[PDB]
Design a protein around this nucleic acid. Sequence first.
RNA 1: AAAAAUGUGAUCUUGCUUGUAAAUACAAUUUUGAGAGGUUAAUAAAUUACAAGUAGUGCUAUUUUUGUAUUUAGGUUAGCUAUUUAGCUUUACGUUCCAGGAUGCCUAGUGGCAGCCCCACAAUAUCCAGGAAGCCCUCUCUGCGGUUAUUCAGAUUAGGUAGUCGAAAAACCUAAGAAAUUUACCUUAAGGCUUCCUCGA
Length: 436
Amino acid sequence: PSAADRNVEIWKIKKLIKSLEAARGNGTSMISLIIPPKDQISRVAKMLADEFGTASNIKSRVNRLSVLGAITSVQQRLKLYNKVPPNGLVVYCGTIVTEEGKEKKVNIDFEPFKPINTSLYLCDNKFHTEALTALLSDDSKFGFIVIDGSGALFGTLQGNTREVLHKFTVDLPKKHGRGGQSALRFARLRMEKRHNYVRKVAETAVQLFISGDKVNVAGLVLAGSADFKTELSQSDMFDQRLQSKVLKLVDISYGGENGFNQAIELSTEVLSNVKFIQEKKLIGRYFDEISQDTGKYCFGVEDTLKALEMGAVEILIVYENLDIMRYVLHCQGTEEEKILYLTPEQEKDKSHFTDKETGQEHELIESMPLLEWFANNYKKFGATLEIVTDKSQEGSQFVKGFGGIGGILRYRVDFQGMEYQGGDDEFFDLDDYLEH
RNA sequence: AAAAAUGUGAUCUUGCUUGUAAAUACAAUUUUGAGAGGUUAAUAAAUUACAAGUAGUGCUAUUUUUGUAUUUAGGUUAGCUAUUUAGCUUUACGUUCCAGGAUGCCUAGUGGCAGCCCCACAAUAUCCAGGAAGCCCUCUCUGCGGUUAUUCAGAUUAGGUAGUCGAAAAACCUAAGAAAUUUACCUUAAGGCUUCCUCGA
């Protein structure tokens, strides 16, 4: 957990994904390997050796060469490291085709950030970036509490990554005491005392959840048996404003990386559901503002860039599937530089770059996507960047008018764009000139 | 050394046994491979002096004379072996090397030899046959050499895993196996397939 250092890793990952997708390999020449942490190398190596034997049996005399080369290449890199480093390793090997019929060979190994037990090895015509994108996802990990009579274990789950933080054990007074009699329910009193310790333990677990007056995980899930967790969940000290956040309580038996794991799996599907309703709560708030007719909320692709420059927008909303990117255009005269936002249809015809309705003359030299730009620069703007999907009806509503981007203002501002959107000076060509 | 003899009762000074004092090479060969603790154990003779007993002698014990001088010297501690002739150990009797002292006897001559104490006649037993080196067994180096946790990293294999071999090796040690190899098992998803009627200036 290091500031900015994590971001650098993210940068390399996104760059890698774009390059991996661009390159296409014929046949079975493309090999992708992901090695999880605390996973023995020898099992992996043996698996690679077994794969090598299979290729020989193929008898292709063409395909076999390509398959053997890929296998041998990955093995050489594997040989260099005696024991696997924490957070695992990712290795890509194979043969790819580049511009002008040139052959390009690739050997990349690096230490991935926070990927546990991916166990992915595939033979295919292209590299798989799905594991890489998991790291990139907006949600911030899952926090799990597994509670049992004989002990308590704490850990976190991110994507398909399993983490164990810390565990401890306490004991309830199990032996009643046949020989000594108090006869009166001193034991009940003892139980009551036990009850307070269970409460305190709850209180301590909660303390773990929040550090630095902040919460470690977006969602926290607790599990247990004999209703210790249900009781555990509702108490004044235990909630710490986090009680509302927890969705499912799951009854478990024989907990100890057994049955306890099952509780985690069911809770996660629901936790994803809370995000859907969390967005909905935002939505209800959004509609109330609409009723108000303040006009504080803005819309339009160009409006958002302008909104950030102003710095008046508290919340920035973007979609992963963004159909709008930033393109720089050269005038026929060559004396003037032009900036415009283009739809995928417009983006595809790079050489003409002309709108049918007006006959506009545009030439495209270099393009910079808006999604990557907004995420990198939101901090200087002061706005908060949030990512949402169009699955929700409200998301669809944004699509009909505003588009792939959304914006929220701290204070009511008229802004610029279409007349419904704001001021009439919707577009400008000033930015292109600075670059050139 | 041989001889008057009062004597001490005429007599002798005790080879014997008993108690006291001191002689009777070291090293090598074997044996622990070595150094070496256990050279473990056990337990050995004789010559001279004193007392007792007495085997001796009467304990103690005395005189004259003779003799340069009877001084000797040499050797024995001979053994074993063979029917006989004769052969023939530095003495082992764990193994092995080396003393050999006492008694008394034979060489004081005779034959050979210049001569002799030499060879023969060499001579009878004969106390100890002693001393020395060597610990059939315990620790160290480990003499068999081994025997090990293993890491390997390799070798060897078509290659893999194991074994074997090698290597870096935790450790341990132990009374000369005089040691031996055949070593396996694992994996191959589809492999490529045609013959019709000139007998052409």
